[PDB]
A paper describes a structure:
Bacteria have two well-conserved topo2As, DNA gyrase and topoisomerase IV (topo IV), which allow for dual targeting by antibacterials, affording reduced spontaneous resistance. DNA gyrase consists of two subunits, GyrA and GyrB, and functions as an A2B2 tetramer, as does topo IV, which consists of ParC and ParE subunits. Topo2As regulate DNA topology by creating a four base-pair-staggered double-stranded break (DSB) in one DNA duplex, passing another DNA duplex through this break and then resealing the break. As part of a structure-based approach to develop novel bacterial topo2A pharmacophores, we co-crystallized and determined structures of DNA-cleavage complexes of the S. aureus B27-A56(GKdel) fusion truncate (gyraseCORE) with QPT-1, etoposide and moxifloxacin.
With etoposide and moxifloxacin, we solved 2.80 and 2.95 Å DNA-cleavage complex structures in a P21 unit cell with two complexes in the asymmetric unit. With QPT-1, in addition to solving a 3.15-Å structure in this P21 cell, we also solved a 2.50-Å QPT-1 structure in a P61 cell with one complex in the asymmetric unit; the three QPT-1 complexes were similar but not identical (see bottom line of Table 1 (for nomenclature) and below). The three different QPT-1 cleavage complexes have the DNA gate closed in different ways. These complexes (ba_ba'2–QPT, BA_BA'2–QPT and BA_BA'2−QPT) come from the 2.5- and 3.15-Å QPT-1 co-crystal structures, which were obtained under the same crystallization conditions. When the QPT-1-binding sites are compared, the largest difference is seen in the relative position of the G1 nucleotide, which is covalently attached to the catalytic tyrosine from the opposing subunit. All three Casym structures (both 2.8 Å etoposide complexes with two compounds bound and one of the 3.15 Å QPT-1 complexes) have angles between two subunits at DNA gate of 173.5±0.6° (compared with 179.4°–179.9° for CRsym structures) indicative of a ‘half-open' conformation at the DNA gate. The four cleavage complexes (two QPT-1 and two moxifloxacin complexes) not in the CRsym or Casym clusters have a range of configurations (angles between two subunits at DNA gate of 177.5–178.9°) intermediate between those of the two clusters. Similar to the fluoroquinolones, QPT-1 is bound between the +1 and −1 bases at the DNA cleavage site inhibiting DNA re-ligation. QPT-1 interacts with residues in the TOPRIM domain of GyrB, with the barbituric acid moiety of QPT-1 packing under Arg458 and making a hydrogen bond to the main-chain N–H of Asp437, and quite a close interaction with the main-chain CH2 of Gly436. Our observations of six QPT-1-related binding modes (from three QPT-1 cleavage complexes) show that, although the interaction of QPT-1 with the main-chain N–H of Asp437 is conserved, the interaction with the G1 base in more variable.
Author numbering:
A (entry chain C): 11 to 490
B (entry chain A): 9 to 490
C (entry chain D), D (entry chain B): 417 to 545, 580 to 638
The structure:
Amino acid sequence: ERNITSEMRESFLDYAMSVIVARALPDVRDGLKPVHRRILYGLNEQGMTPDKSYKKSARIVGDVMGKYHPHGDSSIYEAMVRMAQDFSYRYPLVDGQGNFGSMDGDGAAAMRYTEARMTKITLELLRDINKDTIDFIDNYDGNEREPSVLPARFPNLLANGASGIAVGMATNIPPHNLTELINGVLSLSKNPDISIAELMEDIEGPDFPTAGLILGKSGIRRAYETGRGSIQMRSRAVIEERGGGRQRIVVTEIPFQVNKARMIEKIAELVRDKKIDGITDLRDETSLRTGVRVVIDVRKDANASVILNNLYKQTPLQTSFGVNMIALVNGRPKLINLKEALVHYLEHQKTVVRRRTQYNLRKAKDRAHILEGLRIALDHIDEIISTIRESDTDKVAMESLQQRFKLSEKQAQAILDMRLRRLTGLERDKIEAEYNELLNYISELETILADEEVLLQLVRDELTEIRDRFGDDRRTEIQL
Amino acid sequence: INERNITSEMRESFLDYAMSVIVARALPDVRDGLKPVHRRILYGLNEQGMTPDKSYKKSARIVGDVMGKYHPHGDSSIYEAMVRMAQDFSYRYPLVDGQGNFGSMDGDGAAAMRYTEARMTKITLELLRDINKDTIDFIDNYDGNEREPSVLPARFPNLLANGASGIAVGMATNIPPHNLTELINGVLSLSKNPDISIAELMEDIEGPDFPTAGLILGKSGIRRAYETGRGSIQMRSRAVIEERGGGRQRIVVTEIPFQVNKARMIEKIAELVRDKKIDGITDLRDETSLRTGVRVVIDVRKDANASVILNNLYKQTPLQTSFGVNMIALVNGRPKLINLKEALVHYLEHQKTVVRRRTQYNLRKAKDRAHILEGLRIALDHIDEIISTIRESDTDKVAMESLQQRFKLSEKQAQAILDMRLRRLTGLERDKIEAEYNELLNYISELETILADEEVLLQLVRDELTEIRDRFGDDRRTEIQL
Amino acid sequence: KLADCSSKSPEECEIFLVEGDSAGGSTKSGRDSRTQAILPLRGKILNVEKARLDRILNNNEIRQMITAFGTGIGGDFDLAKARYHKIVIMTDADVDGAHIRTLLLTFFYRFMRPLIEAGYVYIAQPPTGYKGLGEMNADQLWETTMNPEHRALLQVKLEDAIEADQTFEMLMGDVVENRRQFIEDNAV
Amino acid sequence: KLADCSSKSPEECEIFLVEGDSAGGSTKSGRDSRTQAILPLRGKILNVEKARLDRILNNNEIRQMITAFGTGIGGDFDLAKARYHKIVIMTDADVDGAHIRTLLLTFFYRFMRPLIEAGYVYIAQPPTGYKGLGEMNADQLWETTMNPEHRALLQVKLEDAIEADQTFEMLMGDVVENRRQFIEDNAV
DNA sequence: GAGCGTACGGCCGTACGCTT
DNA sequence: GAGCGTACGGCCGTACGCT
Ligand SMILES: C[C@@H]1CN2c3ccc([N+](=O)[O-])cc3CC3(C(O)=NC(=O)N=C3O)[C@H]2[C@H](C)O1
Ligand SMILES: C[C@@H]1CN2c3ccc([N+](=O)[O-])cc3C[C@]3(C(=O)NC(=O)N=C3O)[C@H]2[C@H](C)O1
Ligand SMILES: [Mn+2]
Ligand SMILES: [Mn+2]
Ligand code: NA
Ligand code: NA
Ligand code: NA
């Protein structure tokens, strides 16, 4: 028998917990919810890199479902689709072919009807993942291994944003320009005690894929200061003058996460309900070549400026973005502001780059050890050979080679495994040349781990490379 | 604008569909006994190594690999086919090992594709046995991205063992399942006498052996179907008349005919009692559980004769059904109506050709290997001269010239020597190369014997067929009454 | 789509409320058709602590559960009109499975309280397993959780009506902040 | 099911009979909403050569086409009541697309013959390849088969009435054997 | 408000041949 | 007389937090 309060307390907590930290909230480090990371990682393990051809969605899902994500396919596929939509992601992470829906609320065609691969920027999220930069864990059945977090060589959380509903809390972080983010990470790295207001000298405010307008910097300020603010988003519209004293409103940019077709329905509802008037026609002329374009025709008598302003108020022609910056930090959720957001990220890069350099050291030294035994061997190759020849078994040659030429097991083994073609002159030089270079590389790697600024500067240097390859113009105009 | 004649369009289009459905959808190949879709589940299972010894993989995943790499059609046509291959009441010799709900005889569908698990059965290893040893031709897939086999080696005669029932265009096919132990004996008997008659082949193969057991009435239909390729076979449920106490009588059905929905059979009897077209029946229950198997109980009123009711149930419900044989298989890429012997002759021919190509492939690799070994023996006999020759060399390119020229070695042999490791110079290792070379000379001869004489190959085919017969052969299920 | 049992004696009968449409069908083939009925639950069920009565009584699922129990709800609830003397909650072994349990236990506590006091409400117990209930076949589903001899049913018992009353209010109620602080205090 | 165009001037209007719903969705976005109407075809249409008139006329897919053309069929067929001057058959570039296409042309020839004689019926010409229609995006789908300035249509012409009548009865009639012959005779 | 986004499948059309 | 077995999808419920 079970207590009804107890059963409720425990069981509900169980659900809640998991949803907070294995469903609806992104990590602060790579800016990803579990399903997103599992889709990118699966694309990786499948080798679905940009240079290879597309792969049908149903296969990608099928693998991602079975290997890491023990849930329905619709949650997986829709998530991926989103990542492919240039109107959802400021820096799309999936490169998809066929129908991946529109701003008009249009669904994407089912798994079978679309194919997909990873974008070039998705490579940067996965860079160095195989160089012990991040900790792995078991999957839900123990039969596979998967990452706890991706290296994330660009600030994903603030770049692409995050919006999910959890239990006890929700999150809502707007997308930003990448150039501005990085530059803001560079300023932070140079000055640990830098002010929010000073960081905004780089990071002006959000930057939605959908362009548009932001009214004033007050919301943005509060947002980045407290982690909670309200940001007004306004469509880009102009009133142009036409013959016989007529006018029309043309809307060329609409708010983030606003259904275009559904906004138009609302304008027409207000014309059938006569809650607004002066409007003669209403056309959606959105083409590939003009992009978005909604045209509103205005009755000669009416003032189109009045009409437009009433529309901002009465339809989602103007909408609010309610910033609630909650990410998983140390695996617990946390309201964070712009600085903690950047600070946990920078710290994530300092770890990734350390552990990598640390990894490249263990590998350099390990190789250099082997090359040394190979160099020895190459300087007495006559006696190395006869020594192996006098041996009955590989083990005796191993014993003999170690005792005679003061060699290690890894070194004796390496000499035994040596292919006679290495004895040709060119390969004999290659063995020396590799050693020498490797020594200077271990030098470089030991500089890095010994000085925190040399390391930090490395981080700066690589981040600036990303900036110069993927950084782009700002799309959203922030008005005062 | 261009103009297209409606008549011409109707002939050209409909011929494309018609032909496509025939040679590439609806009819099995006489060799491996598989439709295209089927082959591609099996191959897909195989290229993922979803062998019996490795745990079940999700149905979701399998279908995707098969659809994206080989079968550009909807997910359900692939899945349903895989689910049929996992049903012990559908396949005499199940080709798929499924876990979860894969449907029942009552005709209820298998649970969705995310709610099931699958891998091969041990017998399906035999359909794919020797596939990579240039035994079967490969062709490009639909997009050109992958490769897929045109047929499977099929080391057991599968067309006849599991049957076929596909509706095409302008034709259909319907082949019944058969017992393997009987089928292989028949093949053997044909291998020793090319002129064996059908009636003789029927000493080995009594007739079709359904996975559902039950009864076959008379051998008269089996011959017609086996001689001409068409004919009708009467299937009857196994039903006995139990007598409980003095008055009471019960009719218990334990086996029902093949491809006969049990729930729908039962309803028809419930229907006839309701419409008063059958008298005597008190209750009607389906006590089918896993341990008991199929059990359908009909309670009969006292003063009502069970036998009159039982016979009338045969004539009136699918408790007795006919199986309309129509043995049509793809033969040299064309559809063909084939009799039992043609079926068997084509399979044995497939088998001979598969073993001969296997042997040829093993010989090539064997002859190739011994060549390398020869060069390696030459090297180890003159080691110091060799080492000397390679060290003198500036590059590996000249090292080959200097070795080929000096010791009389092929390009191949100088590459093997330049790719040899210093651990090959120990004393024990020299012995291993001498050993490996000795057995290998003996193995090449064995193979060269097989290829020169038709009868050794013939026997080897027989010998390997007999291995399948023992390991996988089983007792007859379907009783044949006269 | 409820699948009901042959027997019309509530004392020996029992209804299984199962997660997902897949586990519904398997359960229906695996069941003792004489004493065992199944009401499949298409997904997440309404939180009744959050809705006003007019939605509740118009909620197809909540509708199908009342019709099945045959007892009416609230004050009009009649324990003698109960068609089943066992109501077993069968959900997946996973976290969402637990959610749908709480959701069910919320409806039961807030409209069919005397059903809990009379110890008719049971929770089934499938194996602790990454596998769902839908994934497992009919036989495994019957041999593990549905046959009286082998099954482990936790009879749901109520002890303190004032504690429980505030627990539901907190966990399932309108106020988020109180459910935030519960999470905070009790989560590790 | 049909998504009509804004224009009510038949001479400039055209309807597309598209295969499968996914392509029917993208064609609905890529189209020229002023002139071009989309009537999706969710699979294999009824073969009217094998159906009796009561089964034909109760058939939804068939019923939707008649309404959408608005000409009526049989002896009540008026070319002046037509809502589109171009009826375009747009199916996948595979054998099943070909089959649907034979099924449509059979319907038309048997019920709206003078609609073919007037040259109103057309066959679309999508891009050849393994990819079908539902796999193309709406824009590349508009450009390749729907845009009048770049598209290639096949206008269907009836040159010999007596010879065609014999062709439909063989290919699509209920006598199988004559079909078989034709296959075997032309099998390549 | 409602709807943002990760979670928890059934029903029922057609061709086609042979045979009931 | 109905059905066998490979082929050609979209409709819709709920929980959860926030303006
Ligand atoms: C298994 C599904 C079943 N299906 C159905 C089912 C019912 C109905 N029905 O209307 O009842 C129509 C269809 C048509 C179908 C589809 O769903 N979309 C499509 O465009 N092409 C198809 O073949 C077709 C689809 C391709 O395959
Ligand atoms: C994407 C689908 C949507 N879905 C729907 C959809 C509509 C309705 N509906 O009835 O409107 C109910 C459900 C419930 C769902 C689920 O969660 N559980 C289930 O057993 N079956 C399902 O289909 C649920 C399913 C698991 O996931
Ligand atoms: Mn579950
Ligand atoms: Mn197609
Ligand atoms: Na593992
Ligand atoms: Na507004
Ligand atoms: Na009969």
